[PDB]
Design a protein around this ligand. Sequence first.
Ligand code: VDP
Lengths: 10, 251
Amino acid sequence: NHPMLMNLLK
Amino acid sequence: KDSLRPKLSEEQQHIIAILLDAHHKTYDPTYADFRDFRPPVRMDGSSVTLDLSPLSMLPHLADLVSYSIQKVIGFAKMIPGFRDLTSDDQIVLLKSSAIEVIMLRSNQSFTMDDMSWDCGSQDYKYDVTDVSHTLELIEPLIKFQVGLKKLNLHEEEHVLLMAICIVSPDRPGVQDAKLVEAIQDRLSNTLQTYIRCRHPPPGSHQLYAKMIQKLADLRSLNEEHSKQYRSLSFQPENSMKLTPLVLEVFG
Ligand SMILES: C=C1/C(=C\C=C2/CCC[C@]3(C)[C@@H]([C@H](C)C[C@H]4C[C@@](C)(O)C(=O)N4CCCCc4ccccc4)CC[C@@H]23)C[C@@H](O)C[C@@H]1O
């Protein structure tokens, strides 16, 4: 449930 | 027996070069991006008199924090070893340390001439009045920034402290604490060896112990920021003024 933070770590 | 003289190893010199470079790419000391934020509002629109709404600075500071979260993430990804972690541990480390790294890194713009964060112009100079029952957070915060500014850290020490902050193995939700601890140990030894070999006396006296105390001070500010944030974000009129990234990270 952290899609934006997860996207920034890609 | 002469092998006990501290010497900064080649890997330790690479770690410093990477953290310096990562911070130079993620912290713009000209603050040019601040123009993209929702404008700061201190004067009444009718602008020789002050605006009396206590949340008039919220759109601007919310955009500033949200932007700074992006830069902290960008810097953390360059921390040697951070990418060996699972994506869950990375998320747990950033969620926990984001507001602490923001307060650490803000010390670059903080000035003791008038105890404000000065980002190149008076539009982007933030004092206590702007950040303003938020004094529960702001008075400690300012005492913290003064104490940190007085340590007179080399840029090398400064970025190392930011990286040691992010990679804390005791953060809640961390799964692989042994791996996180090994990454932090490599950074801690770098900083301790850096101070002993590169930081001349007298400023280097007890410096590492003082820096670790600032990490301890940050925990208390983190909890304090958490209480203020949960009471602010509860009112829908105020959370409308937030950004999706801040809501996800701080919620
Ligand atoms: C963030 C940085 C900089 C400064 C950081 C500052 C100075 C301004 C005030 C900052 C952003 C603090 C925030 C306001 C904390 C804010 C941001 C927020 C929304 O996360 C929160 O809950 N806060 C504390 C509750 C305050 C509620 C309130 C807000 C506005 C007006 C009235 C009441 C936290 C760190 C401080 C400048 C530069 O060095 C870049 C750096 O990354």
